[PDB]
Symmetry: C3
Subunit: 148 residues, 3 copies
């Protein structure tokens, strides 16, 4: 009993302290939505380099799977005023975009007419400050945003 | 109750280390309050919204101790910062976002002076002193949690 | 109570996620140590003070593994960083802030050379190698916690 009483106080302290630090941590480069957290590195990089940074950090490139997640990601894009790369590509099969796992998209917010594989060479995806998506050359540099 | 005690102990140690990492170099802990700067400047309204959306509010030092902690961030970035208080409701009366009156102040000599008949916001200098300033001006964004 | 048990499990999961978020992109964990860069350069004394005030100390790689982890941050920022060690007390003998002699070193060929007759601090290059450098120079600030 005794060991349980004081233990409750310790857990309550950790919960309160943690709740506070979550807010501190996310300000101003992160966004929490559901059980997902987006965090921007604050700089731009080509797709492959951006992908590697996220994977090595224990996460992956931003992969919005719902309107709510897309809106959260859009807030970071707007704050930095820099379009960002998403994790999805159609590098394997032209015209078919997939997540790093190979799974087909469960959500998309393409701007009208997109994806258009402009110049026959756009296999990556960027999200604009207006929240819309556009396929873009993977060699271009875009804001790095990872999800955890 | 045994293995659980070991987990809680580990969490306290891990959390303490993590807190130090988080606060370096843009945060300051004082009492139960934490100040954190965004590292950039914004006009008051925008700065205020950023803090509110983050689940906090603009820096609101309520004691000499809190003011000193906030001052450290201002000195580190060498950029004066906005406080949360304004006298937008009633000229000459500065209040917190809750309407409550100030329980602490550290005005520079002669301030607040509503210069130009248009200074309803407050900035804190690198010397820790306060000055009322036009809300349209851009100052370092520092929120409290 | 089974209630506390469940709460702790979830706390561990939430904490683990926030730890990964915290380290991206300015931190690196290796073993029980965490390196975190301030993102800017400063002379040694100032860098040392920033780390000590934050409850840590300047980066002090004690193994090849720790050196590699630190190297990642230096490469990512593309800026050589200061280590904690100096030979200010006894020329030629580098020590940690505590006074203890080095237990690991990764000197670049020809180093340390005390070039100019006054290089008592240490910097780590993007290639991971070390070079003794004048303490007055400005290098990337990286602390360990
Ligand atoms: O990614 C490129 C983007 O799709 C653009 O392609 C073309 O140049 C037609 C434009 O209307 C469109 O916006
Ligand atoms: O915010 C403006 C600030 O109060 C300044 O107002 C006047 O121009 C008189 C100055 O001595 C004072 O420093
Ligand atoms: O810190 C100075 C540094 O050791 C340099 O000293 C000399 O000028 C020889 C160089 O090869 C070496 O890189
Ligand atoms: Ca293709
Ligand atoms: Ca394509
Ligand atoms: Ca396109
Ligand atoms: Ca007024
Ligand atoms: Ca006024
Ligand atoms: Ca004034
Ligand atoms: Ca010497
Ligand atoms: Ca020397
Ligand atoms: Ca040298």
């Amino acid at each position: 009993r005794q060991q349980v009483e004081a233990l409750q106080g310790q857990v309550q302290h950790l919960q309160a302290a943690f709740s506070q630090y979550k807010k501190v941590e996310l300000f101003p480069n992160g966004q929490s939505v559901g059980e997902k957290i987006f965090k921007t590195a604050g700089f731009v990089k080509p797709f492959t380099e951006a992908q590697l940074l996220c994977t090595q950090a224990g996460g992956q490139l931003a992969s919005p799977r719902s309107a709510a997640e897309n809106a959260a990601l859009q807030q970071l894009v707007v704050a930095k005023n820099e379009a960002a790369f998403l994790s999805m590509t159609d590098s394997k099969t032209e015209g078919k975009f997939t997540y790093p796992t190979g799974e087909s998209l469960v959500y998309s917010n393409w701007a009208p007419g997109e994806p258009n594989d402009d110049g026959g060479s756009e296999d990556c995806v960027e999200i604009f400050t207006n929240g819309k998506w556009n396929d873009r050359a993977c060699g271009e540099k875009r804001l790095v945003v990872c999800e955890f």
